[PDB]
Each structure stands twice: as C-alpha cells, then as structure tokens.
C-alpha cells in the first residue's frame, strides 16, 4: 500500500529572492523575527538547528550534507552555503549544451 514518490534531482540554484526566503524562514522559525546580527547567530541549539535547517531545506529545497553538518555553527555559514549553486548536469550533458562545432560529433551509446 506504500508507493515510492518520484525521484528528486539534487540540482539547486540560489533563489533570486534568497534573503526573502531566508529571512521569512527565520521570521517564522525564530520568534524574535530576524533580530540584530542574525548572520552571526549561533546554531548550537539542537532544537533551533533542526527547525531552521529543516524548514530552510523544505522551503528552499537544498539540504545540508551530513559531512558538512557540523560546519553550520553560524547563520553566515548557512547563508554562504545556500547561495553557492549546485548543478546535477553531467560533464557530457554540459558538453552537449556547449555550442558544439560542426566538425565535432558526439553520440552517447550508453
């Protein structure tokens, strides 16, 4: 009676209104509604970290790696971590959409 949901891609691009989603997440997750020096706030609290990271991951769609999980001590790391784009495009896929010259032929036989 359990049906698998469709597989989701791991490609994430920074939103144009990145801060809007970020501040809205803090505005909701954090009662103080984005207080002063929010960037320098610590995430050592387990409950706050779970709510903030989980809420950001669902709203944004990008999740902190477990290997990189401990690095997220401050909001600055989270903000910097999210703003860097992530692409699932393969090297072959990038080559295909790279203005292939007329004399170069590529065929994927796999």
């Amino acid at each position: 009676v359990l049906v698998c949901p469709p597989l989701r891609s791991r490609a994430y691009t920074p939103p144009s209104d990145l801060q809007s989603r970020l501040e809205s997440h803090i505005k909701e997750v954090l009662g103080s509604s984005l207080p002063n020096n929010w960037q320098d706030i610590s995430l050592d609290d387990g409950h706050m970290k779970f709510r903030l990271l989980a809420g950001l991951a669902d709203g944004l769609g990008h999740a902190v790696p477990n290997s990189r999980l401990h690095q997220m001590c401050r909001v600055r790391d989270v903000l910097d971590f999210y703003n860097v784009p992530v692409q699932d495009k393969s090297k072959f896929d990038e080559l295909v959409a790279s203005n292939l010259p007329p004399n170069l032929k590529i065929s994927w036989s796999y």
Partner: protein, 105 residues
C-alpha cells in the same frame, strides 16, 4: 633488415605544398568507456584539450562515441585513404595530445 624489408624513394602525394598546403588527415574517431581506468587520461582530454585541437584544425572530422569499451582507441583517416589506429589504453592526457599532434603533422 634492409634486404628483408621494403624501401621507397622520396616523393610527395600530389605536390601538396606547391599551391596551398592541405592537411592529409581527414577524420579522427575516439572511443571511450564511462567506467574504465584505462580511459581516465582520455576522459580528461575531452574535457580540456579536444576542443582546442578542433578549433585549431577545423578541416578534420571528429567523432567522439562514449560506449562500453575494454580499451579506448583512436582512428585517424587520411585523404589518400591511409587509416591508422592507436590504442589509448591507460594513457595520460599529455601522451594523448602529443600523439595527436604527430598524427596531424
């Protein structure tokens, strides 16, 4: 060895350089395997140096066909009809680039 081996005289194909120089090499074919240590050097070559050679020499037809392959291979065809095959098995990017330059010349 000379007695047991053939020899020829100096000659040109059709006086190629009299009016304008034409590159004898006409087609290059590259076979690759997505998962093969032997092709690792060839794998990187496509990313970086294959494009530069194509721009430098646009008169040679280039074929890149990734496929399940035990040993990557390069096939070069010349205008006169000569065809030469070189194995790329477990060869680095630098080795591949040097061979291609020799083939073009």
């Amino acid at each position: 060895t000379g007695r047991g081996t053939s020899s020829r005289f100096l000659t040109s194909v059709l006086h190629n350089g009299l009016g304008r120089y034409v590159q004898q090499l006409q087609r290059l074919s590259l076979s690759l395997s997505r998962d093969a240590p032997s092709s690792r050097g060839a794998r990187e070559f496509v990313e970086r140096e294959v494009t530069d050679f194509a721009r430098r020499n646009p008169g040679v037809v280039v074929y890149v066909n990734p496929r399940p392959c035990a040993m990557p291979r390069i096939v070069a065809e010349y205008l006169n009809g000569a065809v030469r095959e070189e194995n790329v098995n477990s060869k680095s990017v630098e080795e591949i680039k040097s061979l291609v330059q020799k083939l073009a010349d």
